[PDB]
């Protein structure tokens, strides 16, 4: 779906999704 698309500050990822810093890219919000 959205996950793999690149950002960095306001990229603007899918519904839950988030930019991670570590491949700075969408993942999927995992809270705990």
Given at each position: ?32
């Amino acid at each position: 779906g959205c996950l793999g698309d690149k950002c960095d500050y306001n990229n603007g990822c899918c519904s839950g999704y988030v930019c991670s810093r570590t491949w700075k890219w969408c993942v999927l919000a995992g809270p705990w």
